């Protein structure tokens, strides 16, 4: 439901179960795949000029 709602998906890996006296340990494992990007840098300047000396 959530993945359809927002667009994030997971990979199932395995399920394991074990018990300890009064309590039962149900253990899941998952994995995410995603790209990474760098922070938002800022320019240095903008262009408007031209000299074109045009020597001999």
């Amino acid at each position: 439901a959530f993945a359809g709602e927002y667009g994030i998906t997971f990979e199932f890996v395995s399920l394991d179960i074990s018990t300890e006296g009064d309590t039962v340990y149900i253990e899941f494992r998952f994995r995410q795949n995603f790209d990474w990007c760098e922070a938002d840098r800022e320019s240095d300047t903008v262009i408007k000029a031209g000299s074109f000396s045009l020597n001999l």
């Binding site: 300890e20 006296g21 009064d22 309590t23």
Partner: protein, 126 residues
């Protein structure tokens, strides 16, 4: 062993089990022996919110129980032990192995694992 030691009163039971319709397993325990016994701790315990012992490696004992040897009895895997005391809640022991005090054949010593101690413990089937 001296006479005075055997402070505790215990009931030795046998286990009979079957399967519910849902598939879960059912246990019922039958009293078979009555008598006084002496109990010694061997290892520490950790209690859940309702006193059921929590420990892996079920095969290691915690308490030593001694009582009169009986040649007409044949203890086996399916044994248990029950004890109801004056104030403290009842307790169930599970019996691991067995040993004569010596081959003099006078006293039978059991090695046991503590399981439960709370007010809701089921009492042995008479």
């Amino acid at each position: 062993m001296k006479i005075k030691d055997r402070k505790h009163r215990v009931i030795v039971c046998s286990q009979k089990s079957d399967v519910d319709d849902n598939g879960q397993l059912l246990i019922s325990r039958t009293g078979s022996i009555n008598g006084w016994a002496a109990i010694e701790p061997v290892k520490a315990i950790r209690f859940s919110k309702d006193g059921v012992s929590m420990q892996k490696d079920t095969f290691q004992p915690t308490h030593d129980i001694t009582m009169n040897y009986n040649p007409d009895v044949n203890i086996s895997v399916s044994a248990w032990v029950y004890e109801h005391r004056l104030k403290s809640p009842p307790r169930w022991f599970k019996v691991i192995s067995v040993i004569n005090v010596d081959e003099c054949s006078q006293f039978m010593r059991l090695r046991s694992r503590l399981v439960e101690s709370n007010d809701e413990v089921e009492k042995p089937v008479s």
